Amino acid sequence: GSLTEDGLSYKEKFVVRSYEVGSNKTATVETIANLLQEVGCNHAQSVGFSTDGFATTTTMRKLHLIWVTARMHIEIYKYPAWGDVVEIETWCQSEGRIGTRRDWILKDSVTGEVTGRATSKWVMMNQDTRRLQKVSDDVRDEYLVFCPQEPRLAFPEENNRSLKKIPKLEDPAQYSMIGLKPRRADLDMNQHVNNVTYIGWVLESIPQEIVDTHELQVITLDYRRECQQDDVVDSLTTTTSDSQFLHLLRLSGDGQEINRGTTLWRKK
Amino acid sequence: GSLTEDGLSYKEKFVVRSYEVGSNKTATVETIANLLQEVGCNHAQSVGFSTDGFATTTTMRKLHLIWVTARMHIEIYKYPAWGDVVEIETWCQSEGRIGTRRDWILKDSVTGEVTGRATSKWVMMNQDTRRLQKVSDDVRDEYLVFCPQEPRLAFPEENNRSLKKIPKLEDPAQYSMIGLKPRRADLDMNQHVNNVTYIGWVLESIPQEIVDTHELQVITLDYRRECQQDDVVDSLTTTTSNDSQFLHLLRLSGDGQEINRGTTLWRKK
Numbered sequence: 001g002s003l004t005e006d007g008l009s010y011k012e013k014f015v016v017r018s019y020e021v022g023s024n025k026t027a028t029v030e031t032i033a034n035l036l037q038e039v040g041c042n043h044a045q046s047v048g049f050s051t052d053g054f055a056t057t058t059t060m061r062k063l064h065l066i067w068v069t070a071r072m073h074i075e076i077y078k079y080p081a082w083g084d085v086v087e088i089e090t091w092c093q094s095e096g097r098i099g100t101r102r103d104w105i106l107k108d109s110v111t112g113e114v115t116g117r118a119t120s121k122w123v124m125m126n127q128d129t130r131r132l133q134k135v136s137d138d139v140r141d142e143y144l145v146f147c148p149q150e151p152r153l154a155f156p157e158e159n160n161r162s163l164k165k166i167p168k169l170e171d172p173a174q175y176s177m178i179g180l181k182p183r184r185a186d187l188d189m190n191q192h193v194n195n196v197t198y199i200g201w202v203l204e205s206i207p208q209e210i211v212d213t214h215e216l217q218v219i220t221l222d223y224r225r226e227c228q229q230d231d232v233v234d235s236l237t238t239t240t241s242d243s244q245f246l247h248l249l250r251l252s253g254d255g256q257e258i259n260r261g262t263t264l265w266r267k268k
Numbered sequence: 269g270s271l272t273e274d275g276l277s278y279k280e281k282f283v284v285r286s287y288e289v290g291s292n293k294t295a296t297v298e299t300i301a302n303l304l305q306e307v308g309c310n311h312a313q314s315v316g317f318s319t320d321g322f323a324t325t326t327t328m329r330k331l332h333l334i335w336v337t338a339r340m341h342i343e344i345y346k347y348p349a350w351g352d353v354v355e356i357e358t359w360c361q362s363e364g365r366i367g368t369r370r371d372w373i374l375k376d377s378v379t380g381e382v383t384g385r386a387t388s389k390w391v392m393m394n395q396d397t398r399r400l401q402k403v404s405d406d407v408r409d410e411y412l413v414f415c416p417q418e419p420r421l422a423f424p425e426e427n428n429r430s431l432k433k434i435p436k437l438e439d440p441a442q443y444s445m446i447g448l449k450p451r452r453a454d455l456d457m458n459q460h461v462n463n464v465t466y467i468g469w470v471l472e473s474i475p476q477e478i479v480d481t482h483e484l485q486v487i488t489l490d491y492r493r494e495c496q497q498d499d500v501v502d503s504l505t506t507t508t509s510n511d512s513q514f515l516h517l518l519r520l521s522g523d524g525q526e527i528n529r530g531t532t533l534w535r536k537k
């Protein structure tokens with residue numbers, strides 16, 4: 001992989017592996033999400049950020065601040081097949097004091113056609129107290145040089161799915177997957193649960209029949225709280241309609257909300 | 269990746285990804301196991317076996333037979349770091365009517381030094397009745413041309429760990445991880461549970477303190493039965509020993525049906 005000629009975006013090619021595909025012999029949405037995450041790490045490294053933390057500026061490190069995902073939105077037109085090469089182009093953009101936004105474009109390396117696109121919102125938080133905060137001007141000035149100045153949006157449409165408000169699922173849920181625990185493979189290098197596990201957990205409440213007859217077109221996921229290594233999660237789903245679902249991830253015991261989202265599916 | 273000049277083994281390089289590493293910023297034993305599995309698929313494809321099934325010969329397909337793993341043994345000297353390139357060389361050998369053996373050699377692409385090695389035993393089984401069987405001559409002859417004729421063993425040594433008999437863990441277990449269920453990411457393309465999930469499940473009963481202060485050197489895992497998508501598994505562990513040794517057992521919760529057994533060896537960092 002490498003930064004483009006202007007040093008304002010990063011590109012990387014990936015060959016789709018045998019264990020990364022589902023029953024249709026195409027990459028799963030979790031494989032895609034992991035590749036998006038990998039190309040974002042590589043972009044951060046190629047522009048100067050160290051391996052100690054994900055894209056933490058010099059002032060963020062002295063103030064004990066980290067970037068946390070608040071929202072992830074992914075739209076797939078075509079899932080790459082086992083053996084194919086998928087090229088992903090990623091870039092970051094400043095959203096004033098609200099935080100940061102990272103976008104991705106997926107393409108078939110053989111044809112050059114766009115096969116998917118993603119967008120994510122990243123907010124600042126204290127690594128120790130876990131308290132969210134608005135980005136300070138001196139932190140913003142240290143990273144703005146790595147961002148395109150004019151807006152460059154994967155989802156330009158003024159009235160699009162990536163910015164829609166997500167409601168809270170009402171009990172009783174139509175479908176459910178209870179007792180979900182993360183294992184060591186679900187943890188990242190800092191022992192926290194990987195953001196891609198929540199995607200897999202949200203999809204566990206979708207009935208097998210819907211997965212066997214439909215393809216996932218869109219998934220929008222809001223991140224409210226982190227699931228810890230020793231937490232147990234319940235995944236809840238209700239049909240709101242193509243097929244549409246409302247999702248909710250909550251802690252098994254007290255019902256503490258950790259995630260909410262929606263998925264849209266097409267008939268094959 | 270590509271077959272070597274003689275067409276009797278296959279090589280492939282991999283860059284270690286960010287999500288593939290643990291707390292030490294080096295690849296996990298499950299990442300290694302997945303890479304071994306991937307290079308074995310690529311070897312099967314590079315020599316003519318179709319994407320419909322894993323290394324199934326023409327006679328195997330008409331008789332509804334598949335290759336199943338009976339044992340997996342992995343010994344790691346150095347875990348590759350995030351960003352490093354690991355080169356893996358794999359080959360398969362005929363073990364007469366017993367079945368076949370697949371071996372692997374892991375190397376640092378920058379230094380050429382061996383950093384790990386693995387071996388696995390594959391047995392023949394009916395896709396539908398699930399009944400194991402000895403390999404017939406008709407099948408053996410169709411795949412013998414893709415194997416080195418003289419023995420080529422990753423684990424040559426007189427009495428090595430890869431062939432040792434594994435005993436059954438006695439109740440009560442010292443450590444346990446109860447209620448383990450596979451999710452869709454744990455399933456392969458044929459909707460069966462991936463063999464690497466059993467490795468992760470066996471390691472779940474190892475206390476976090478042992479993982480934080482030790483490095484896994486060896487893991488030997490016997491496969492007795494498959495865990496189905498709607499099965500719930502219990503992972504049991506007992507210390508059997510500078511180094512630490514454990515006896516492992518994976519069994520179904522609903523009746524205690526054994527699915528896996530194995531051993532792990534760890535060294536102090």
Ligand SMILES: CC(=O)N1c2ccccc2CC[C@H]1C
Nearest residue numbers: 043044055067092100143146
């Ligand atoms: C968190 C994140 O992705 N960031 C990043 C990473 C790589 C390259 C540029 C940027 C902008 C600075 C920062 C917000």
Ligand SMILES: CC(=O)N1c2ccccc2CC[C@H]1C
Nearest residue numbers: 311312323335360368411414
């Ligand atoms: C199961 C297996 O890995 N096999 C294989 C695969 C790729 C290349 C050669 C071989 C030998 C034939 C067969 C036993």
